[PDB]
C-alpha cells in the first residue's frame, strides 16, 4: 500500500527536487511534484541500504538519480518500484536491468518519459543504491563478478563510465526507491 502527496511550490522539498531537475531541464514547465510513500518498499530499500553501508566502508552507497517512464507504468512503480516485471527494460547495451540517469535531461527524452494523450511527461527522482560499480556490457542479467575466481561476489551496479558516470543500471529489487514523481510538459 502507498500514498501520494502533492508538494506545494513553497515547500523546501519541492525546491530541492525542482532545483536538481532544472540544472538540465529548466526549459520544461513543471506541473507538479509528488512524494510517493510506500512503507513496505521503503523499509525493504533501507534494509538493503544497511547491509551495503556495513560492507562498502567509506563508499557513499546512495545517489539520487532520474528515471523517465510512461504514464501507464506509474501505478506499477508506485506499488512495486523497479522490480522484475517492470516493462521499461528495452535498453540492453550496459545490461538487462533498470537504467537511472545522473541528470534529468536523459530521463526527459520522449522515448523514456513518453508524453501521454494530454502531453504530460513523468520523471521519478529516485534513491538508488549504486554502491561499488564497474563498466556494464550487453550480456549482463546481473552485475559482473569482482574477481572471476569467485563468480558469486558481484558489483552492486554498473555504469557507462566508471570515473565520469552519466547512467547506472540496477539489477535487484529494493535497490531503488521511487521517492518523487515530477509531472511536467514542454
Ligand atoms: C524507461 C527508461 N529507460 C531508460 S534507458 C536510460 C534511461 C532511461 C530512463 O530514464 N527510463 C536514462 C539514461 C539511459
From Swiss-Prot:
Location of the protein in the cell: Nucleus; Cytoplasm
Superkingdom of this protein's organism: Eukaryota
Domain PARP catalytic, residue spans: 1-186
Induction notes from the record: Up-regulated by IFNG in macrophages. Down-regulated by IL4 in macrophages.
Entry comment on modification after translation: Auto-ADP-ribosylated.
Annotated tissue distribution: Expressed in macrophages.
Family of this protein: Belongs to the ARTD/PARP family.
Role summary: ADP-ribosyltransferase that mediates mono-ADP-ribosylation of glutamate residues on target proteins. In contrast to PARP1 and PARP2, it is not able to mediate poly-ADP-ribosylation. Has been shown to catalyze the mono-ADP-ribosylation of STAT1 at 'Glu-657' and 'Glu-705', thus decreasing STAT1 phosphorylation which negatively regulates pro-inflammatory cytokine production in macrophages in response to IFNG stimulation.
Assembly mode: Interacts with STAT6. Interacts with PARP10. Interacts with PARP9 in IFNG-stimulated macrophages; the interaction prevents PARP14-mediated STAT1 and STAT6 ADP-riboslylation.
Name of the protein: Protein mono-ADP-ribosyltransferase PARP14
Gene name tied to this protein: PARP14
Residue range from the parent sequence: 1616 to 1801 of 1801
Amino acid at each position: 500500500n502507498f500514498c501520494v502527496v502533492e508538494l506545494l511550490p513553497s515547500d523546501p522539498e519541492y525546491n530541492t527536487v525542482a532545483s536538481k531537475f532544472n540544472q538540465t531541464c529548466s526549459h520544461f514547465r513543471i506541473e507538479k511534484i509528488e512524494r510517493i510513500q510506500n512503507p513496505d518498499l521503503w523499509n525493504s530499500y533501507q534494509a538493503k541500504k544497511k547491509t551495503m553501508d556495513a560492507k562498502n566502508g567509506q563508499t557513499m552507497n546512495e545517489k539520487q538519480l532520474f528515471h523517465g517512464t510512461d504514464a501507464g507504468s506509474v501505478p506499477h512503480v508506485n506499488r512495486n518500484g523497479f522490480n522484475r516485471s517492470y516493462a521499461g527494460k528495452n535498453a540492453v547495451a550496459y545490461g538487462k536491468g533498470t537504467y537511472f540517469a545522473v541528470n534529468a535531461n536523459y530521463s526527459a527524452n520522449d522515448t523514456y518519459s513518453r508524453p501521454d494523450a494530454n502531453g504530460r511527461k513523468h520523471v521519478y527522482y529516485v534513491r538508488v543504491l549504486t554502491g561499488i560499480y564497474t563498466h556494464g556490457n550487453h550480456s549482463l542479467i546481473v552485475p559482473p563478478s569482482k574477481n572471476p575466481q569467485n563468480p558469486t561476489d558481484l558489483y552492486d551496479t554498473v555504469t557507462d563510465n566508471v570515473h565520469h558516470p552519466s547512467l547506472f543500471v540496477a539489477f535487484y529489487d529494493y535497490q531503488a526507491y521511487p521517492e518523487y514523481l515530477i509531472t511536467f510538459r514542454k
